[PDB]
Design a protein around this ligand. Structure first.
Ligand SMILES: Cc1cc2nc3c(=O)[nH]c(=O)nc-3n(C[C@H](O)[C@H](O)[C@H](O)COP(=O)(O)O)c2cc1C
Length: 144
């Protein structure tokens, strides 16, 4: 139940810094994407995007960041070696006591296909629970 013990794909970014960089990436995220921490810490997550990534879906994420709201989408992402995967992606802002966004949590559920129906429902339920758990752990450890 510790932040570093959560065995899920996620990053935490700081939108009060230039270009909303990654300030924490989970071990699972590194294994999934094949990047190491000296490669992606302090960088924006958009390195996951590539030729087949749908630009309109990316705009939805952009808008949600600009508006400081949550969002859930499915989109194609790329590992460092350039292999494609489908990503059910959930963005969850982390607000302090007065409602200022301190960080964004980003959770990735990787797969080989875009999901529909009950399988999409399941995936979305899962990543939204994971984001809740991350937010609680980070706060309980005064991690950031
Ligand atoms: C916490 C967080 C996690 C993100 N995770 C992903 C991701 O897993 N895959 C992806 O394609 N974009 C992800 N993004 C989106 C990019 O960082 C960026 O916000 C998006 O591409 C839109 O901004 P842009 O138009 O400048 O590229 C994430 C953003 C944040 C803030």
């Amino acid at each position: 139940t510790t932040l570093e013990r959560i065995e899920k794909n996620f990053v935490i970014t700081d939108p009060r810094l230039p270009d909303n960089p990654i300030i924490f990436a989970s071990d699972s995220f590194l294994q999934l994407t094949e990047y190491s921490r000296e490669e992606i810490l302090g960088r924006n997550c958009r390195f996951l995007q590539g030729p087949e990534t749908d630009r309109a879906t990316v705009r939805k994420i952009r808008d949600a960041i600009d508006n400081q709201t949550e969002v859930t989408v499915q989109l194609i992402n790329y590992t460092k070696s350039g292999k494609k995967f489908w990503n059910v992606f959930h963005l969850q802002p982390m607000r302090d006591y007065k409602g200022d966004v301190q960080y964004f949590i980003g959770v990735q559920l990787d797969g080989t296909e875009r999901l529909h129906g009950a399988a999409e429902r399941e995936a979305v339920c899962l990543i939204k629970k994971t984001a809740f758990q991350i937010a609680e752990a980070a706060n309980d450890e005064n991690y950031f």
